[PDB]
């Protein structure tokens, strides 16, 4: 590789109570940033979300804004690049309802979400509600108008995102798990949403 330093190509790699921590506005490189850390049982997750925008696009005739989300692997190389694109597509399907696009014509908002540390003692399903929490904080910190606070929860691999105080749904992610958990997951994630919502609102007011 003439772009980076990959080293010797003839070598081989190595072969062998909910708690939240929220911090926003700690990056001066962008317009809005957020830090989300969650520790539960034997599984903790720490990720960082950066928001760059809204910045004008030359020649753009779009009467509304354009959101782009990309997930990255900060340290541990676990999640496939194909799967990262899938979640990104899912995340954009959420905030396109959340973000007031009519406010930013001829403009675009780029969202970078760095997945730093994730310990585990499906798989990426559990990180999804934390990514939504991070982005919604980073957007609100950046100054981007949001119609409502976006939040979600993970119950038996079934992720569902809520707005308008859980009355409606802005995203639904079902992978593996089992059946007939429709009513249960909707009630369990709604509790996680309300919990994540109040902590998100408190996070923006305090600092």
């Amino acid at each position: 590789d003439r772009r980076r330093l990959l080293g010797p190509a003839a070598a081989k790699p190595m072969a062998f109570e909910q708690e939240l921590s929220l911090h926003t506005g700690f990056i001066e490189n962008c317009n809005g940033s957020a830090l989300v850390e969650a520790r539960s049982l034997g599984h903790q997750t720490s990720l960082i979300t950066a928001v760059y925008g809204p910045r004008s696009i030359r020649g753009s005739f779009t009467s509304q804004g354009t959101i782009s989300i990309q997930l990255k692997n900060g340290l541990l190389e676990k999640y496939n690049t194909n799967e990262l694109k899938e979640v990104s597509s899912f995340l954009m399907g959420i905030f396109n309802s959340v973000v007031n696009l009519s406010r930013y014509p001829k403009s675009g908002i780029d969202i970078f979400v760095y997945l730093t540390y994730d310990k585990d003692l499906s798989q990426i399903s559990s990180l999804i509600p934390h990514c939504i929490t991070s982005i919604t904080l980073a957007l609100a910190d950046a100054g981007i108008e949001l119609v409502d606070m976006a939040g979600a929860g993970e119950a038996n691999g079934t992720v569902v995102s809520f707005i308008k105080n859980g009355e409606e749904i802005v995203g639904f992610w079902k992978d593996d798990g089992d059946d007939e958990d429709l009513l249960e997951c909707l009630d369990r994630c709604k509790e996680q949403y309300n919990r994540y919502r109040d902590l998100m609102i408190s996070c923006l007011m305090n600092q």
Binding site: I67, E86, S97, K164, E167, E168, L182
Partner: protein, 255 residues
């Protein structure tokens, strides 16, 4: 790319209580398709599907031999869309989605591809989308389904590697189906047209295996403009809609 005058017309027409589709279809009607099978001798299985809008998808089924103890995934689905990159956002999304739809521990029996206690058949599924005027996730799904129904592999000889030089094995399995739904106002829609998805408030991707709803189940945004939140009753309605009209489409594609 429709004008606002068209979008405002189609929305008011679809969001109405007696929802009128632009083509007259009922919320459960499917557009007429055409499926060709077994047209590739070099491959173990093949399929081709033509849609109403002119959408086309070619799916090829090939296989090899490898240890199933060193390989957890015996089913690899690759998607190549014409005029699109291999690292494109939509391409890698569908590539990742179909792999979850067809997986050894999701919607596909792993014992079916089991020959011996040591070696087993690994199936390579290739997808070539010639034309796409909408979300091909449902179109490709019907193509992979018909491709796995008509498949021929080298026939085994011993038990628990050698193969039969002439006679072949026909893989009989129940491949999963993926039905994309459109959420417009308070009404649910099956098989969204090109122009319908551009005004739809939201959308649903629902899978189907063994006469029952199964994972993956996603909520995709069919557009980037008129995307709005939806009530939970629409998800229960949509799922039930797929549930009752699935034995009809399965029965049709069976012949």
């Amino acid at each position: 790319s429709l004008s606002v005058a068209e979008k405002s017309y189609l929305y008011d027409s679809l969001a109405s209580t007696p929802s009128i589709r632009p083509d007259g279809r009922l919320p459960h009607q499917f557009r007429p398709i055409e499926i060709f099978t077994d047209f590739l001798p070099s491959s173990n299985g093949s399929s081709r599907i033509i849609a109403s809008d002119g959408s086309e998808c070619i799916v090829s089924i090939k296989s090899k031999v490898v240890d199933h103890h060193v390989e957890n995934e015996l089913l690899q689905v690759d998607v190549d869309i014409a005029g699109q990159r291999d690292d494109a956002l939509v391409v890698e999304t569908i590539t990742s989605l179909l792999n979850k739809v067809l997986k050894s521990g999701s919607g596909v029996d792993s014992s079916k591809l089991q020959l011996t206690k040591k070696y087993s058949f690994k199936i390579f599924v290739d997808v070539l989308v010639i034309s796409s005027h909408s979300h091909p996730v449902s179109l490709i799904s019907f193509a992979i389904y018909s491709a796995l129904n008509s498949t021929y592999l080298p026939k085994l000889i011993s038990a628990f590697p050698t193969f039969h030089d002439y006679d072949m094995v026909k893989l009989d399995i129940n491949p999963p189906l993926v039905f994309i739904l459109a959420v417009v106002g308070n009404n649910m829609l099956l098989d969204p047209a090109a122009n319908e998805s551009e005004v739809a408030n939201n959308g649903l991707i629902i899978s189907w295996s063994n006469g029952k709803i199964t994972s993956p189940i996603r909520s995709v945004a069919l557009n980037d403009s008129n995307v709005k939140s939806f009530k939970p009753h629409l998800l229960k309605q949509g799922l039930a809609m797929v549930e009752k009209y699935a034995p009809d489409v399965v029965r049709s594609l069976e012949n």
